[PDB]
From a paper:
Kinesin superfamily proteins are microtubule-based molecular motors driven by the energy of ATP hydrolysis. Among them, the kinesin-4 family is a unique motor that inhibits microtubule dynamics. Here, we report that KLP-12, a C. elegans kinesin-4 ortholog of KIF21A and KIF21B, is essential for proper length control of C. elegans axons, and its motor domain represses microtubule polymerization in vitro. We concluded that KLP-12 binds to both the microtubule lattice and the growing microtubule plus-end and activates its ATPase, thus achieving microtubule motility and growing microtubule stabilization.
For crystallization, to stabilize complex formation between KLP-12(M) and tubulin, KLP-12(M) was fused to DARPin by a long linker. We solved the crystal structure of the GTP-tubulin–KLP-12–DARPin complex at 2.9 Å resolution. KLP-12 forms an ATP conformation in which switches I and II take the closed conformation to hydrolyze ATP, and the neck linker docks to the motor core. In the nucleotide-binding pocket of KLP-12, the density corresponding to AMP-PNP was found with the Mg2+ ion. The back door between switch I Arg218 and switch II Glu266 was also closed, representing the pre-hydrolysis state during ATP hydrolysis. KLP-12 Arg267 interacts with tubulin Glu414/Glu420 in H12 with the hydrophobic support of KLP-12 Val343 in α6 through the hydrophobic stem of α-tubulin Glu420 of α-tubulin, albeit Val343 is not conserved well among kinesin-4. The other interface Lys269 in L11, which is conserved among KIF21 subfamily and KIF4 subfamily but not in KIF7 subfamily, makes a salt-bridge with Glu155 in H4 of α-tubulin. Two arginine residues, Arg311 and Arg317, in α5 of KLP-12 form ionic interactions with Glu410 in H12 of β-tubulin. Intriguingly, KLP-12 induces intermediate curvature of the tubulin dimer, with the α- and β-tubulin angles being 4.6 degrees more curved than KIF5B. This precise control of tubulin curvature by KLP-12 is achieved by counter-clockwise rotation of α-tubulin and clockwise rotation of β-tubulin around KLP-12, seen from the left side of the protofilament.
Residue numbers in the entry:
A (entry chain A): 1 to 45, 48 to 437
B (entry chain C): 1 to 12, 14 to 132
C (entry chain E): 4 to 102, 104 to 132, 137 to 162, 167 to 233, 251 to 300, 305 to 365
D (entry chain B): 1 to 430
The structure:
Amino acid sequence: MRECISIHVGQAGVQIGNACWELYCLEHGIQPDGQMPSDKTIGGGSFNTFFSETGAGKHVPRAVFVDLEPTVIDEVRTGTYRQLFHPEQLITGKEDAANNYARGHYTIGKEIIDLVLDRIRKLADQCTGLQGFSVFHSFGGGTGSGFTSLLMERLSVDYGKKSKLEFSIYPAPQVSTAVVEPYNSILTTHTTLEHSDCAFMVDNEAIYDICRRNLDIERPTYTNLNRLIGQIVSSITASLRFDGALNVDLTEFQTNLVPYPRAHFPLATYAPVISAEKAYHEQLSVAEITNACFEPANQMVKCDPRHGKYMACCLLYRGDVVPKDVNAAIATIKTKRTIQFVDWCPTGFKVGINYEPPTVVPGGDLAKVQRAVCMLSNTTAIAEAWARLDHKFDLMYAKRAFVHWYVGEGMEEGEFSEAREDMAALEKDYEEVGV
Amino acid sequence: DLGKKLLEAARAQDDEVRVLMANGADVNATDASGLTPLHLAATYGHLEIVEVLLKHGADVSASDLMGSTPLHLAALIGHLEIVEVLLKHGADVNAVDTWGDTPLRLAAVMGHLKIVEALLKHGADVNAQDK
Amino acid sequence: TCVQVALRIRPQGNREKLEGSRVCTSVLPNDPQVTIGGDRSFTYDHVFDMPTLQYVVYESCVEKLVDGLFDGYNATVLAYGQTGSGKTHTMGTAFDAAVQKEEDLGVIPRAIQHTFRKIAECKAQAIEEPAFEVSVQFVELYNDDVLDLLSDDRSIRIHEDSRGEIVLHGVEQRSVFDMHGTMDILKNGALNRTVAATNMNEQSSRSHAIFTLHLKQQRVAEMLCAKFHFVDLAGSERMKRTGATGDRAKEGISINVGLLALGNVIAALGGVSHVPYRDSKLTRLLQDSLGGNSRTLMIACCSPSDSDFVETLNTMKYANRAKEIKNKVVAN
Amino acid sequence: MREIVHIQAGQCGNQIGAKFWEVISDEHGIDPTGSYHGDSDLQLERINVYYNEAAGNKYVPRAILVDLEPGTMDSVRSGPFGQIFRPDNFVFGQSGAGNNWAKGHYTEGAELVDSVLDVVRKESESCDCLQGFQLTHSLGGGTGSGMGTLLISKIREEYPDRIMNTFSVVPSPKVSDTVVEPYNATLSVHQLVENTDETYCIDNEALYDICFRTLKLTTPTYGDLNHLVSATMSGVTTCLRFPGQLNADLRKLAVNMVPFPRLHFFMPGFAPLTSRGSQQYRALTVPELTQQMFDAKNMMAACDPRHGRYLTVAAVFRGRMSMKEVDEQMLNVQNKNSSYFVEWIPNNVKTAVCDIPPRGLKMSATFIGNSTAIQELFKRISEQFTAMFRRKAFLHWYTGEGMDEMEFTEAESNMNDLVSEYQQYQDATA
Ligand SMILES: Nc1nc2c(ncn2[C@@H]2O[C@H](COP(=O)(O)OP(=O)(O)OP(=O)(O)O)[C@@H](O)[C@H]2O)c(=O)[nH]1
Ligand SMILES: Nc1ncnc2c1ncn2[C@@H]1O[C@H](COP(=O)(O)OP(=O)(O)NP(=O)(O)O)[C@@H](O)[C@H]1O
Ligand SMILES: Nc1nc2c(ncn2[C@@H]2O[C@H](COP(=O)(O)OP(=O)(O)O)[C@@H](O)[C@H]2O)c(=O)[nH]1
Ligand SMILES: [Mg+2]
Ligand SMILES: [Mg+2]
C-alpha cells in the first residue's frame, strides 16, 4: 500500500474521471453508494489505494474533480454517484475559461487555485505513505490546458518529492469545440513539461475512429469515447490497484517507460476492441491480441511506429492469460516483425498479467472479452503528432490570429514565441535519440 | 452686405427672398465656398425660391470652388421637383465637379431612382458604373 | 530615409547579483553588434554596453535628431524593452526627490539644453534675430486613457491632422522660454506619472509617457516647425515575476495589450498592405513615428543577466526587424 | 457565465427587439402572461439566460426599453407581449432625436441616460454570473444610433470585463431614402469598432432584396423585413438558449469568431428563406441546407461571400436530422470551395446543432460568418458618406449640437481602415 490521488481538471477531465471511477467501482464490486458486499472483503495483509475506507464501510475515491464552470460537476453531484464522492472533493467556480489558456493559468484560475490546493491537502493529510497524483485534463479546453499547468507548478512546490502522472486529451476536429486548441495545447505542454514524469496522450480522433469500425458507432458521443477511454485508463492503473508485478510504484512508470526526462509521452495500444453487437465471437488468443498491439489502427495516438525507434515497451495483460503463451508471442514479434530500438538502449519487453476478467460497462457497447492486453510503447514516432499540432499552431501564430485574447488575459506576447520554441527543441529531442 | 443675407435666406424664407432682391441684392452672390443662392436652395429643398431666383437672372450652371452645380446638389438630396425645374431652364447634366463625379452618379450612389431616370433622359455618361 | 535602432544594455542590478544571475551578452570594443547566450547574434546602428554613461548615448545617436528640428525635421526617440531594463532611467522621465541630478541625465533633459543652446547660437548674427516658439505637451496612456501630465486632471481625444498627422485634442500645450522652466514642467509632469512597485522594479512605469517638444522657427530666406516625441514606454511584464494583483495586475495587462499592438506594427513594416495602428491608442500615438514624417531612433533596453534571457531575446528580435522600417520625411 | 441583459433603443431597435422577445418566448413556452405552458423540459433548462424568475413561477425578460420618443413604447405595451415586460424597465423620454446621431449622443438623451443606466445597474445586481449585454439598435440615425452608441460606451467603463454584442441594422437607400443616413452610420460604426466585442450586421439593403427578388413581395413593409430579422436573432442566439457544446456563451463565441481585435463584424445567413404568408416548402432539397446558408442570396448583408474569404464560420442546424449527413456535407462545402476559407486558421468552421426548431419549420439552419466580403457593406456606406460629406451637405445639424467636423473625418478614417484590414486578410498567404 502507498496511496494515489486523482485530480480531474476541466470538462474532459471530469467526464473521463467519472467514467474511470464507474469502471473502478465495478472492478472491485463497490456500489455507487460506497458500500461493498462482505463477500469481497479480505483478511488484511482491499488493495484499493485509490479508495479510502471509512467507518460504516463506505469507500470514497481519492479524487478531486475541478471545473471553473459548474455545469459538468453539477451532473456528478446529482447522478448515480452523488453517494460515492464527498462534496468537498467536487470544487467548482462560476465563470469558465472561455476556451482561453490564459484565463485558466493567469486570471480566472488564480482565483480558485488556493482552495483546490487546500482541499487536495485533505486527501493527502489522510494518507500514511503517498506516491503522488494521477491528473486528468484536456489540451484544447481553457481550464484543461491552463488551470492544469497552474496546478502542476504548485503541486510541484508543495509535494515536490511526489510523482505526477497525467492522462491528457489530444484534440481532434471531429469534436473540436474551439479554434485555439492548438494554441492551448502548445501552451499547456510547454509550461507542464518540466512537471510531469509520464503523460499518456489520448487522440480523440484515434478513439473516435476505433469507436467507428470496431464498435460500428457512426457518430460517436463523449459517452462512447469515455467508455472506451475508461477502459485503457484501467489497464494503466490495474497494477496500482491489484498488487501487481510491473509498475508497482508510480516511480516505476518513469523507470520502465521514460529513460530520457523530456521524451516522456508513451504510446498506448489496446486490444481487443470488440463490439457488444457481435452475436458469436471466438475469443482471441494471447498471440492474436498481442499482434494487434502492433497494428496502428488500435493505438490511441495516430502515428507510424514503424517510421520510429522504440525505447521502452511494457505489455499489460488481463484475464485468462497463461504466462507461458505470453513469451511465445513476445519471442515472435522479435522475428515475424522488425522493431528497432534506440542506438543506445536495452532491448526487452516487460510483462504484467492481472488474471482478473476484463470488466466492461453492463449494457454498453464494449463486449466482455476474455483476455485483453494494453501495450505502452514509447516511440519516437509519436513526434509525428506533435508535428501536426505544431504546424496548426504555426499557421495562426504567423498572423498573430487570436493572440490578443491571451495577452488580454494575463499573458505576454513572447510567451507564445517561447512555448513554441520549447516545441522546436522537443521535435529535435525525438530526432536525436532515434536515427 | 445684402448679398450675404440673401444667401442666408435661400438656405433657410421665401417672403424675405423677394424682399431682399427688390433691395438690389445679388442673385449670383457667393459665399467663401462659392455657393450662389440657387445652390443653397436646391440642396435644402426649397422649390419656390429655386424658381424665384431663376426668373431674375441666376446662373443655373454656376459652379462653386469645388465645381458644384445647382443640380449636382439637388440630385444628392433627392428633390426631384427642383431637379426638373432646374433642367428646363438650361441646366447641364453631363457636367463634372472637382472630385470627378456627375449629377448622375451622385443620384445613383444615394439611391434616388426617381431622379436617375430623369437625368438619363436629358443625358448620361460613361464615367459611372454599369449598375 | 529609414528607422535607426540602438540597443543599450544596463549593468546588472542588485537583485541579479545577490541572486546569482550572470552575463550572457557580449559586445566587442567599438562594435555595432551584440551576441547573446553564445550562439545567437544581432547587429544594430549602435550598441552601448553596460558601462556606457548617459552622455555617450546622447551624442552618438540623438544629437543629430535635435539639430534637424531647427531644419524643420520631426524626430522620435522611443525606449522599448522589458520592465527594469532601463527605459525610464535612459529617457530621463523620472526624478528622485532625494538622491540630486549628479549628471547621469537622460535623453529628454540633455535634449532640452541642446535646444536652448543652438537657439541663441543661431540668434547671434549680423543679419537681423530669428524668432522661435518652443512649447511642450506631456501625456501618459494609462489603461487605455490618454491622461494629461501638465494639468489638474478630472476627456481628451485622438484625431488625424490636416496633413494626416496624429494630433491630441484637449491636451495642455504650454509654452516655455529657457532651460530652467522647461525643466520644472518636466519634473511636475513626472510627479503625475502613474508609477507603482512590482517585484521587477520598485519604480515601475504603469503607463507610456510622451514628452513632445514643439519648435516653430521663423527666419529670413520662411517658417520651420518640427515636433519631437520622447516616448518612455512601459515594459512588458509577466504576472509570475511581477507578483501583480488587482489594480496592479490590470495595469500590467493593458500595458501588454498595447505592446502587442506595437509588435504587429513593427512586423507589418518590414518583416505589408495594412498596418494595424488602430489596435491600441499607443500605436495611434506612434503612427507618424513609425509610418513616416519622423526621424526615429528606437533605443531598445536590455537586462544583461540570464535571469532575463528569453525576454531580451524578444526585445532584440523586434528591435532587429524595426531597423527595416521606412520613415518618409519632409520638412515642415 | 449564465445571464444576459438585453437593451433595445430607437424605433427600429424597439421593434425588432420585441419580435425577438416574441419569437423566443414561443420557442421557450412562455405565453404573454409569463406562465410556462411548454411541452419540454429542454425549454426551461437554460431559461435564465434571457429571463428572470419571480413570484408565481413567472418569467419576465431582461430587457431595458429605451426611446427618446414615447410613440414606440406605447405601441409595444399594446402588442402581444408588452404585458410581460417589467414596467419600471420602460425608459422613454419625450424630446425625440430628429433622426440625428448628435442629438441622441450629446444633446437629448445624454440626459435620459444615467436613468437607463440606473435600471441597467438594477437588473444586473441580481445576476449570479453576467455574460454581458445585447443591444437592438439601428445605425440609420437618431435615438438608436446616438444614444445607443452612448449606452454602449457608458456600459463599457462600468462592466469592462463583460461581452458587448449588438444587432445593428444597417441603412439602405432602397428602404428609407433619408438623405442624412450615411452620416449616422459612419458615426455609429466608429463607436462599434472601438467598443463592441461582436456585431451582427442586419443590413436593410439585403433584407429589402430578399423580400423583393427572392420572396417576390413587391411592396415590402417593416413587418416583412422584421420577420426575416427575428428568424435571424433566433438562430444566432439558440446556442445561448438551449443546452449544447459549441459557442455556448457570449465570451466563448467571441473567442471562436474574432481573430483580430477589430474585425468583430459578422454577416448572418438563414435557410430556409420564408415569408409571413406561411407557405412551407420543405424537403425541396434537404442536405443543401448547407448550400443555402453559404449563398449570397441568403445572407443578411449586401455582400457576395464569394468576393472574399471566410475567417470563422459558425453553422447551427436546428431540427430533427442526422448528425452524420450534417458532418459529411459540411465537410464537403469546405472542400469543394477551398479558397473561400483562409488557410492560416485551420478548422475555422464550427458546426453546432439543436433539436427544437422554430414554429413553421421542420428543419432550419442559421449562419454566422466572419467573412471579408463584409467590406462591400462598409464600402457602400463609405461612398454614400463621402458623397454627402465632400459637399458639406446638411453638416450643420450636427455642429449645431456640440459636435465638430473632426468626429466626421475621424469616423471616416476608422471605417476606411476597417475596409483595408478586411482586405489584407482577404488576400494573405503561406
Ligand atoms: N474524450 C473526451 N474528450 C472531451 C470530453 N469533453 C471535452 N473533450 C475534448 O476537450 C476539448 C475541449 O476541452 P474542455 O474540457 O471542453 O474545456 P474545459 O477544460 O472545460 O475548459 P473551458 O474552456 O474553461 O470550458 C475538445 O478537444 C474536446 O474534443 C469528454 O468528455 N471526453
Ligand atoms: N545603465 C544603467 N546604469 C545604472 N542604473 C541603471 C541603468 N539602467 C537602469 N538603471 C537603474 O535600473 C532601475 C530600473 O530602470 P528603469 O529606467 O526604471 O527601467 P524601466 O524599463 O523603465 N522599468 P519599467 O518602467 O517598469 O519598464 C533603476 O534603479 C535605474 O536607476
Ligand atoms: N428593418 C427595420 N428597419 C427599421 C425599422 N424602423 C426603422 N428602421 C430603419 O432604421 C433607420 C431609421 O432609424 P430609427 O430606428 O427609426 O431611428 P431612431 O428612432 O432615432 O432610433 C432607417 O434606415 C430605417 O430604414 C424596423 O422596424 N425594421
Ligand atoms: Mg468546461
Ligand atoms: Mg519605464
